[PDB]
Coordinates of C-alpha atoms in Angstrom, one line a residue:
X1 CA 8.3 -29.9 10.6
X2 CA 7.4 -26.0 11.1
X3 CA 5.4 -24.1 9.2
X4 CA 5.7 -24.6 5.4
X5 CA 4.9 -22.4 2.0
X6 CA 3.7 -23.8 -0.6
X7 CA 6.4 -24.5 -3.5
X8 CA 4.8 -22.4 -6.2
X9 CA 4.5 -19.5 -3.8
X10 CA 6.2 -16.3 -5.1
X11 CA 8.6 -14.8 -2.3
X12 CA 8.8 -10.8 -3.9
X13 CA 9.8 -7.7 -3.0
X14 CA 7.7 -4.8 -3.2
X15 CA 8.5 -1.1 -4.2
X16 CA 7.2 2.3 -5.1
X17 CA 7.8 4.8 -7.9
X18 CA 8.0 7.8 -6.3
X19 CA 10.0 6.8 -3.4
X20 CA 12.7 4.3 -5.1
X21 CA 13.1 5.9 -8.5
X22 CA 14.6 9.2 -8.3
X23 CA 15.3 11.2 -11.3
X24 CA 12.4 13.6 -10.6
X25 CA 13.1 16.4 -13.0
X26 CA 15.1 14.6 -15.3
X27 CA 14.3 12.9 -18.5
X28 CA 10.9 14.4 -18.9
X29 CA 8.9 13.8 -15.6
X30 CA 6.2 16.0 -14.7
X31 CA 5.2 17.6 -10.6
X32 CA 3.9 16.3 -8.3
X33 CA 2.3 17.1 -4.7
X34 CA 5.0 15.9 -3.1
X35 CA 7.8 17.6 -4.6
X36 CA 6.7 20.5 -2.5
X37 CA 5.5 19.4 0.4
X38 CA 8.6 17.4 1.1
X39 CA 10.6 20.6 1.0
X40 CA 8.5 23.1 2.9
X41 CA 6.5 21.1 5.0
X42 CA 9.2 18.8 6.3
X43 CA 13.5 19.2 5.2
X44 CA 14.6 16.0 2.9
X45 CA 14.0 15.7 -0.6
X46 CA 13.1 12.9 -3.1
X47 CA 16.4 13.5 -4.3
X48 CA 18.0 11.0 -5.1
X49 CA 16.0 8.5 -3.7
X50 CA 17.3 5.0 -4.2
X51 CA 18.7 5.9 -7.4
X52 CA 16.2 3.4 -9.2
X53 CA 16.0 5.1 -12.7
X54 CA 19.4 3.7 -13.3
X55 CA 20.3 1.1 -10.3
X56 CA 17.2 -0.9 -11.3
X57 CA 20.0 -3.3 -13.3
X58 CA 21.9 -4.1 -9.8
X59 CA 18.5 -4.6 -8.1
X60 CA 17.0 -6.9 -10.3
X61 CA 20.2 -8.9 -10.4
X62 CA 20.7 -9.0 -6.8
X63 CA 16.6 -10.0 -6.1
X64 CA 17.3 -12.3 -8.3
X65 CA 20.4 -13.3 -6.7
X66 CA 18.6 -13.9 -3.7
X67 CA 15.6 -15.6 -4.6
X68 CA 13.1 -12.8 -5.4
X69 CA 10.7 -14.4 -8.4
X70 CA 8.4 -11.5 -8.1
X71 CA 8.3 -7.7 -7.4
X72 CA 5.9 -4.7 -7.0
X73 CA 6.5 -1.3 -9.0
X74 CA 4.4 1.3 -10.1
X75 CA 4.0 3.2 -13.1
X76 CA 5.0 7.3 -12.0
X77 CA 1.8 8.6 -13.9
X78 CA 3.6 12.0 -14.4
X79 CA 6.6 10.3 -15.8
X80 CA 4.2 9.0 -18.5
X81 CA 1.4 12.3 -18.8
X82 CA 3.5 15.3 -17.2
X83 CA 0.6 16.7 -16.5
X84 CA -2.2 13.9 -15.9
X85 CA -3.8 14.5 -20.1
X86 CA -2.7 15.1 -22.9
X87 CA 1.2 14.3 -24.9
X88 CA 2.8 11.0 -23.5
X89 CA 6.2 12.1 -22.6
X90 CA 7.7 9.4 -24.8
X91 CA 11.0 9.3 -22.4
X92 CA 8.9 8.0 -20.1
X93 CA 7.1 5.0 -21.4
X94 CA 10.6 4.5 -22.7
X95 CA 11.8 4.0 -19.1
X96 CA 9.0 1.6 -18.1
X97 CA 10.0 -0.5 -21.2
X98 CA 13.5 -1.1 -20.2
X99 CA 12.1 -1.8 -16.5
X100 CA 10.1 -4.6 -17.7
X101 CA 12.8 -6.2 -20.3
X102 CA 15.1 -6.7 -17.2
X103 CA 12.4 -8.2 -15.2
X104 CA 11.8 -10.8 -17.4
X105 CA 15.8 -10.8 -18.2
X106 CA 16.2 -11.4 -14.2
X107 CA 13.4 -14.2 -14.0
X108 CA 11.4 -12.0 -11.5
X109 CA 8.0 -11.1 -12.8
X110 CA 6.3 -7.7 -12.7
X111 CA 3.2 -6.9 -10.6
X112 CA 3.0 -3.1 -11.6
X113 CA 0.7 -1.1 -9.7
X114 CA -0.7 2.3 -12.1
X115 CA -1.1 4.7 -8.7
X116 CA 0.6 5.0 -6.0
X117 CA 0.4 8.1 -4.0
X118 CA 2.1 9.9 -7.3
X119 CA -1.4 11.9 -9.0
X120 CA 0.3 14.4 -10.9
X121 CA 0.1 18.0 -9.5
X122 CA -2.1 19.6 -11.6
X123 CA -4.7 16.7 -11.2
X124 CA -4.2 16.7 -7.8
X125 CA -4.6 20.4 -7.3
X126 CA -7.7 20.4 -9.4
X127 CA -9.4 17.9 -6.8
X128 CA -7.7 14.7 -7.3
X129 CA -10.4 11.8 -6.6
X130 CA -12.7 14.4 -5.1
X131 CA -12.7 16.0 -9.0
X132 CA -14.9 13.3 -10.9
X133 CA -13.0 15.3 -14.3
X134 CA -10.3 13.5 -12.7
X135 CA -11.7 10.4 -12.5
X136 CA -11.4 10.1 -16.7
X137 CA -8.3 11.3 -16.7
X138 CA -7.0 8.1 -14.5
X139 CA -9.5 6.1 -16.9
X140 CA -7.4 7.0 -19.8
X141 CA -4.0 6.3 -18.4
X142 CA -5.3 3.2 -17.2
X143 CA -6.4 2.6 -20.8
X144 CA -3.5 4.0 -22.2
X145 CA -0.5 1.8 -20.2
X146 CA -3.2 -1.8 -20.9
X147 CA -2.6 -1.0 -24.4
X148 CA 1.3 0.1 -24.2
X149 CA 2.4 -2.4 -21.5
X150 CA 2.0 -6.3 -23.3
X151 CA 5.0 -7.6 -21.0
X152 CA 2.8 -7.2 -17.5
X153 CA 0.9 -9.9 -16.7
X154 CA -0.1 -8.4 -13.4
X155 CA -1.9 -5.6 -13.4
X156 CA -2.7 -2.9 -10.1
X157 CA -5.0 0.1 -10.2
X158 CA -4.6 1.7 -6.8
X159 CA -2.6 1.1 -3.9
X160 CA -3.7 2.1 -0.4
X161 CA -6.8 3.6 -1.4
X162 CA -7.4 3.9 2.5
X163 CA -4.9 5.5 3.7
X164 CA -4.8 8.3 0.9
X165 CA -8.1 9.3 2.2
X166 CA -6.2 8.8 6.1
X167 CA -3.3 11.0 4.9
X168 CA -5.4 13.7 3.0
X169 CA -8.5 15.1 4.7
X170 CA -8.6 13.2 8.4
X171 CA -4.9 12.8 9.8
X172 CA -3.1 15.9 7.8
X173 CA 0.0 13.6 6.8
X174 CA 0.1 13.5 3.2
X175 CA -0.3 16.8 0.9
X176 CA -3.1 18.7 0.4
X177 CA -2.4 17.9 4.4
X178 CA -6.3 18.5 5.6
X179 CA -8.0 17.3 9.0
X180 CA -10.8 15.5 10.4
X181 CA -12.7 15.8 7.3
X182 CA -14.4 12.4 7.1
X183 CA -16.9 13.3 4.1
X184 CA -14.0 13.8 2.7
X185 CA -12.5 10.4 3.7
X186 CA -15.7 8.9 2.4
X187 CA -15.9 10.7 -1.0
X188 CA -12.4 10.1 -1.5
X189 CA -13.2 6.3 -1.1
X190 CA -16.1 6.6 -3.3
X191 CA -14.7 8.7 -6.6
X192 CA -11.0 6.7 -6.3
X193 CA -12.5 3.3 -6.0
X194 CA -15.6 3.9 -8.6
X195 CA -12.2 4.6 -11.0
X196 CA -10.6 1.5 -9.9
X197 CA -13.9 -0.1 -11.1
X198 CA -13.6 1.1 -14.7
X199 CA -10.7 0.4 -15.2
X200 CA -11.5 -3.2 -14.2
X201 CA -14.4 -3.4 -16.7
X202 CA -12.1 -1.8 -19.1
X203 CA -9.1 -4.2 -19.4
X204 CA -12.1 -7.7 -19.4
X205 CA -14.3 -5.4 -22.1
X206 CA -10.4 -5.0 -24.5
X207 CA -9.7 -8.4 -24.0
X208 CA -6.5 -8.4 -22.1
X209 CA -5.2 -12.0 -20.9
X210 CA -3.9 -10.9 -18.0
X211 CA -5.0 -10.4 -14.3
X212 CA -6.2 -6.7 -12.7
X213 CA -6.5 -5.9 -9.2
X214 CA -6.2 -3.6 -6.0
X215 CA -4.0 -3.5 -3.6
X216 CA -5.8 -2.1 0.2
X217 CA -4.5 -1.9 3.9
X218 CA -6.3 -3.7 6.1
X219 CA -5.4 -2.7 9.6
X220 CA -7.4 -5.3 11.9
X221 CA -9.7 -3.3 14.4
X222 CA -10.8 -5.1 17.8
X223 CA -12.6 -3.6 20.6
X224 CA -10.6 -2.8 23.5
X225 CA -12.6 -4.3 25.9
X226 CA -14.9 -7.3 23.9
X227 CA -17.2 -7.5 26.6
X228 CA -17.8 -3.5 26.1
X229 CA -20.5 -3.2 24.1
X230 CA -19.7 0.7 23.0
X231 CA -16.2 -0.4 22.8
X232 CA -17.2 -3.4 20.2
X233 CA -18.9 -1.0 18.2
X234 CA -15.9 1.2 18.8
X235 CA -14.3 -0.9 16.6
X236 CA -17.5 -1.5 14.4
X237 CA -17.4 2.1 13.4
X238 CA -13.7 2.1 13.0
X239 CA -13.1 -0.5 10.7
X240 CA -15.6 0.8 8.3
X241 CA -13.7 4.5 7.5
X242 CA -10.4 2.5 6.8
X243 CA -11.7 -1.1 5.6
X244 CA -15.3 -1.9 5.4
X245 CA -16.9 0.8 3.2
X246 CA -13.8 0.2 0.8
X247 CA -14.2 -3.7 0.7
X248 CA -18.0 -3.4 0.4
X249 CA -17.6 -1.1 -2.9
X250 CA -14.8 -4.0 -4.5
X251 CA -16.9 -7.5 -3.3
X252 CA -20.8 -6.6 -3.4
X253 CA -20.7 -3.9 -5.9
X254 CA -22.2 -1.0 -3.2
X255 CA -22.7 -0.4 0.5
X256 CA -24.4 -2.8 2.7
X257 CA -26.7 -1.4 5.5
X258 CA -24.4 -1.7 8.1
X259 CA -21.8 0.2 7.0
X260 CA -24.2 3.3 5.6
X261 CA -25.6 2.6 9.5
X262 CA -22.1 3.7 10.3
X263 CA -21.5 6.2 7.8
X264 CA -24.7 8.2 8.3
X265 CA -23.3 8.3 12.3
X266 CA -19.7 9.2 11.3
X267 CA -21.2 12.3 9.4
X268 CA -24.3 12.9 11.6
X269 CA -21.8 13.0 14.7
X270 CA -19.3 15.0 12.5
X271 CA -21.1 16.8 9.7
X272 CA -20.8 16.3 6.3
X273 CA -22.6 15.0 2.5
X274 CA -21.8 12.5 0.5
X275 CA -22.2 12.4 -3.7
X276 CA -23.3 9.2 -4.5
X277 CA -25.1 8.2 -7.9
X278 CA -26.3 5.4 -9.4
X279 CA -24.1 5.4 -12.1
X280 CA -21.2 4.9 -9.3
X281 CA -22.8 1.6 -8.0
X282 CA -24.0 0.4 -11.7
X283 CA -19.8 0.9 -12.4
X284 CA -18.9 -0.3 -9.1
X285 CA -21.8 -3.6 -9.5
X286 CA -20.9 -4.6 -12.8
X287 CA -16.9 -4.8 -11.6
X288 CA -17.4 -6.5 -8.4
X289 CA -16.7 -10.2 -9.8
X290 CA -14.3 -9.0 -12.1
X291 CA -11.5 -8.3 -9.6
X292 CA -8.5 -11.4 -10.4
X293 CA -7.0 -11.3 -6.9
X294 CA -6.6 -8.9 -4.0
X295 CA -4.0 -7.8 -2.5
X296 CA -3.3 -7.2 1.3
X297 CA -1.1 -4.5 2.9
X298 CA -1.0 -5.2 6.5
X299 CA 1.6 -4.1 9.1
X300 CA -0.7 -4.1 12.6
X301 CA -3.7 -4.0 14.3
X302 CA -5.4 -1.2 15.9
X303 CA -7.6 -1.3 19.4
X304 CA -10.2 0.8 19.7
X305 CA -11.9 2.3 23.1
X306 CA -15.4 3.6 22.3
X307 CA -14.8 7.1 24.0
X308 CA -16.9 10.6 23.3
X309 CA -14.8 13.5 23.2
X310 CA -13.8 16.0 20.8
X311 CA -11.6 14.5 17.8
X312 CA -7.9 15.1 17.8
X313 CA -5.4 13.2 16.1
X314 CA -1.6 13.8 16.5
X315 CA 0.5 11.7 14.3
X316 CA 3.8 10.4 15.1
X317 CA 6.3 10.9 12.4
X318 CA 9.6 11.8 14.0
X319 CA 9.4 8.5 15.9
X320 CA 8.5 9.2 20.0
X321 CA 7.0 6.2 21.9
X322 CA 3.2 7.4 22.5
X323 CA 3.2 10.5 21.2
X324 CA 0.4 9.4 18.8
X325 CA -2.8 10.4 19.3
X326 CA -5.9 9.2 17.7
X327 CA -9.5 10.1 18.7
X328 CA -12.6 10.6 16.4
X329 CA -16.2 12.2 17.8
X330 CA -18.6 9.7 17.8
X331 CA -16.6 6.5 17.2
X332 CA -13.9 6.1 20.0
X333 CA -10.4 6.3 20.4
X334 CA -7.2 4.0 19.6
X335 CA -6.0 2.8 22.7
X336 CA -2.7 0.4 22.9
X337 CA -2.7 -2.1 25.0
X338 CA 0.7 -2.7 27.7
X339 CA 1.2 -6.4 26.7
X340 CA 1.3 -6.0 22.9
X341 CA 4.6 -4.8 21.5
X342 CA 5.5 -1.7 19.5
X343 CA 8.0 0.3 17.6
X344 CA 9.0 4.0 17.6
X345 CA 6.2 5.4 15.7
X346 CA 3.7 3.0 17.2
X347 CA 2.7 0.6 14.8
X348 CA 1.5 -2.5 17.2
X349 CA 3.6 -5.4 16.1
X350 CA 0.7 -8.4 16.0
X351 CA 0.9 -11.0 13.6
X352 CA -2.4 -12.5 14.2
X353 CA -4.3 -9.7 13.4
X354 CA -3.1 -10.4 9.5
X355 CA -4.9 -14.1 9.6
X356 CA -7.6 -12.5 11.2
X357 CA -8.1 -10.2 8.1
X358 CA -7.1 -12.8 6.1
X359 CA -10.3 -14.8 7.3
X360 CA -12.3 -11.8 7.7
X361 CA -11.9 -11.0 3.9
X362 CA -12.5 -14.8 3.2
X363 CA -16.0 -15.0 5.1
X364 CA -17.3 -12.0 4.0
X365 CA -16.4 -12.2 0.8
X366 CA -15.8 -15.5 -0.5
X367 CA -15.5 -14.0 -4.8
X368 CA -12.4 -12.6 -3.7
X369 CA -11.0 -15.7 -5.8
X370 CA -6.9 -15.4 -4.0
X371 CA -4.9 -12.9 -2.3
X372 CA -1.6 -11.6 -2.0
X373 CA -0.3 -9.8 0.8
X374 CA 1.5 -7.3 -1.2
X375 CA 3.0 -5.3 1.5
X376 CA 4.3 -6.1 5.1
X377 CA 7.9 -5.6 6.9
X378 CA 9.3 -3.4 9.8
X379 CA 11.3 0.0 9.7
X380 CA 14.0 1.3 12.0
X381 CA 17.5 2.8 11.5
X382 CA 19.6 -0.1 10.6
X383 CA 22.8 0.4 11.7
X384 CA 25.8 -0.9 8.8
X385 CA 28.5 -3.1 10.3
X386 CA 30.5 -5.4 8.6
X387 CA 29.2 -3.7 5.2
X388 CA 25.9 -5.7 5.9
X389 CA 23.0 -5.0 8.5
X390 CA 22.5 -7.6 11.5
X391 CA 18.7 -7.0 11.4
X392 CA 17.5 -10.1 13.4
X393 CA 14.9 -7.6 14.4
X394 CA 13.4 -7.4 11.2
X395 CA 13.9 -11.3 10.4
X396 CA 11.6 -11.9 13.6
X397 CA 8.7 -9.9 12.7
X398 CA 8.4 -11.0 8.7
X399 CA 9.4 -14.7 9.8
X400 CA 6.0 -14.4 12.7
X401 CA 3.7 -13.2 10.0
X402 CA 5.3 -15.7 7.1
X403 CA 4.3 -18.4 10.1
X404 CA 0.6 -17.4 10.5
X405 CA 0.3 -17.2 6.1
X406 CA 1.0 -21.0 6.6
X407 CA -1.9 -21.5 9.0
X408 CA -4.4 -19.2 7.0
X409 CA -3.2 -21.2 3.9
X410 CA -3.9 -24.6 6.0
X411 CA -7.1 -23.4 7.3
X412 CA -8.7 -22.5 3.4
X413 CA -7.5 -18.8 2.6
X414 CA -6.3 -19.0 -0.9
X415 CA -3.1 -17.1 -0.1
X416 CA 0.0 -17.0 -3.0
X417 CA 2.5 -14.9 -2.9
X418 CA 4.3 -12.6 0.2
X419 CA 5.9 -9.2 -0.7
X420 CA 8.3 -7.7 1.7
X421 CA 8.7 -3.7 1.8
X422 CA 10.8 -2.5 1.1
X423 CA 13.5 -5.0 -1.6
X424 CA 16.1 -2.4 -1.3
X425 CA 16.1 0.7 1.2
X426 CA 14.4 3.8 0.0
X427 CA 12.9 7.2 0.6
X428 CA 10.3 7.4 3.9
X429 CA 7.4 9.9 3.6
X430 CA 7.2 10.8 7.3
X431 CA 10.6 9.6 7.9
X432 CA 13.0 9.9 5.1
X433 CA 16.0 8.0 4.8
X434 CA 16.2 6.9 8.4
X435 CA 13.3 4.5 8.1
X436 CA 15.3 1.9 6.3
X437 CA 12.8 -1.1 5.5
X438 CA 14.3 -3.4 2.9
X439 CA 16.2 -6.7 2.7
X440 CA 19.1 -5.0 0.6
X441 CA 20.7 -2.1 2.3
X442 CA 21.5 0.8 0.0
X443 CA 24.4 3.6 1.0
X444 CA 22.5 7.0 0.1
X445 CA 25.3 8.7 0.2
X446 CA 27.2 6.3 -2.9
X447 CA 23.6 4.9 -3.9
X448 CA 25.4 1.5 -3.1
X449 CA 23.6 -1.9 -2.2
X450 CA 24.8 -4.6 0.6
X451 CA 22.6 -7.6 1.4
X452 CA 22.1 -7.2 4.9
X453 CA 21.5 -10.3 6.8
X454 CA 17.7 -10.8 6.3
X455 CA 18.4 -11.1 2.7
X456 CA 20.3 -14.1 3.0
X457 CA 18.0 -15.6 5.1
X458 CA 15.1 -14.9 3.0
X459 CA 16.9 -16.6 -0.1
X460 CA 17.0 -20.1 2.0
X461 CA 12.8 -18.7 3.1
X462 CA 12.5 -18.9 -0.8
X463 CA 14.5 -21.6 -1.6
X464 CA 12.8 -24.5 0.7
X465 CA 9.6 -23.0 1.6
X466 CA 10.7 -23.6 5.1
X467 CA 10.2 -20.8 7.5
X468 CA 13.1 -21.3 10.3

């Protein structure tokens, strides 16, 4: 009678190397930006994360335990290449091995993603995506772990390819922590998703019977105003830094004239050059139909107010209703509306922004064959009672977008699969351990894990594709 999934529709849990795993010095694992960054720019460590280089066995019990048939991790490229080329650190593909044996032991398959946000420090110091020597370094790996890895059947080249460009050069966040540099933002884009493009034409050219595929935020952008004109295009220009140029480069194989229209503004407005060769759009062309599925990382939408001005962007990390800022020269600013709810770090909380991206990405670009939202859930400090976590909070805002996957599904999208974030608690970037997301709560302190109360409810989610 309510909204309902469809029965082969895999209910996973999604995770992250670097931020689950732990062990980052031991057994062979090679830098990494953050490893700094964490402790001089901010006060908590990686250390020991959610214990995953050993715990994985309880994890991948208890997802299965609760009706988790599927579940994102990523390859830690430095576990693998300490240093990005060169000797495989054989402890490391060791590790990834015994992962995947208890996946399949635990009946919940692996969708491993190759990068995500881990480019091993001496890669990432010499450039990272903005190094195009770089660019055959993550060509190899890619290479490298197709040939290794036989047990994946789901393949991921790079996860948020948007918001590393976000954190990087334009909002400070993530290490090397620059701002405002949008021909940065929009080389970034280019070089990191020309190499997600090779490594697609790689894995069809070897013959690999799997699926390959990327993984990209789409945060919805509406005007603030419709009716305004400059506010409409507000959003115009918006979208197309952290959704449109990307999208263009996977689906048509290079940039339609709208969004160079917008990208030749950005960087008139705001100065900068972009490298662009042909070789880059005959790799990115011959990949474009070549992608298996995409995958969707929503959380919210953002409203944008055409408004001239200076750029300034202040982001919210510690968690302070409206203290974010967010204003770029030329394009507008973000600009919450009063009615729409929010969180402490003000992420809108608008579950019909991810069916509208959902259709967008249909409509445009109908090749996109299926998707997978392979990301999604909300993040506050959970507070343990009862050795379990009465998050009806949480329940709420995954149930609300679960309810609009049924209608997008109903209404043609080719949607199959929902991955919460996180499956177990673990290790915040701009929050560390206080921004507990998964359905499993795990005690840092004793590395121990206790369902909390959305697990439970998710198993009957899973178990009768009913969402109630």
């Amino acid at each position: 009678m309510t909204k309902t999934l469809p029965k082969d529709f895999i209910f996973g849990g999604a995770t992250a190397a670097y931020q689950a795993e732990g062990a980052t010095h031991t057994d062979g694992k090679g830098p990494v930006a953050w490893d700094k960054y964490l402790e001089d720019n901010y006060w908590y460590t990686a250390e020991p994360a959610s214990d995953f280089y050993h715990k994985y066995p309880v994890d991948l019990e208890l997802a299965e335990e609760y009706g988790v048939n599927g579940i994102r991790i990523s390859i830690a490229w430095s576990r693998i290449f300490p240093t990005g080329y060169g000797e495989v650190n054989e402890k490391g593909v060791e590790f990834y091995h015994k992962l995947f044996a208890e996946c399949h032991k635990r009946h919940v398959e692996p969708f491993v993603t190759l990068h995500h946000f881990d480019t091993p420090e001496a890669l990432h110091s010499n450039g990272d995506f903005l190094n195009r020597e770089n660019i055959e370094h993550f060509i190899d790996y890619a290479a490298f772990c197709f040939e290794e890895f036989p047990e994946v059947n789901y393949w991921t080249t790079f996860n948020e390819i948007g918001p590393i460009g976000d954190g990087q050069y334009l909002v400070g966040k993530f290490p090397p922590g620059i701002k405002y540099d949008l021909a940065k933002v929009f080389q970034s884009h280019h070089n990191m998703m020309v190499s997600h493009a090779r490594a697609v034409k790689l894995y069809k050219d070897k013959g690999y019977k799997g699926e390959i595929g990327v993984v990209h935020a789409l945060p919805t952008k509406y005007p603030y105003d419709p009716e305004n004109p400059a506010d409409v295009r507000a959003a115009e220009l918006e979208d197309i830094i952290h959704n449109k140029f990307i999208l263009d480069a996977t689906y048509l194989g290079h940039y339609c004239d709208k969004t160079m229209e917008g990208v030749n503004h950005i960087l008139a407005e705001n100065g900068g050059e972009l490298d662009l060769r042909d070789e880059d759009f005959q790799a990115l062309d011959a990949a474009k139909d070549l992608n298996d599925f995409l995958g969707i990382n929503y959380y919210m939408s953002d409203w944008m107010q055409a408004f001239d001005g200076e750029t300034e962007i202040i982001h919210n990390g510690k968690g302070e209703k409206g203290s974010s800022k967010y204003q770029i020269k030329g394009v507008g600013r973000r600009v919450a509306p009063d009615y729409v709810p929010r969180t402490d770090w003000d992420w809108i909380i608008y579950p019909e922004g991810l069916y509208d991206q959902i259709m967008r990405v249909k409509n445009d670009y109908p090749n996109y064959k299926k998707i997978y939202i392979t990301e999604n859930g909300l993040g506050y400090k959970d507070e343990f009672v009862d050795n379990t976590v009465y998050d009806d909070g949480r329940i709420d805002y995954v149930k609300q977008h679960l309810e609009v996957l049924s209608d997008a599904i109903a209404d043609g999208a080719n949607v199959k699969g929902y991955f919460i974030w996180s499956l177990m608690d673990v290790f915040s970037w701009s929050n560390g351990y206080e921004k507990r997301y998964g359905l499993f709560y795990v005690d840092f302190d004793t590395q121990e894990r206790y369902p909390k109360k959305s697990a439970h409810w998710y198993k009957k989610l899973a178990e009768t594709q009913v969402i109630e």
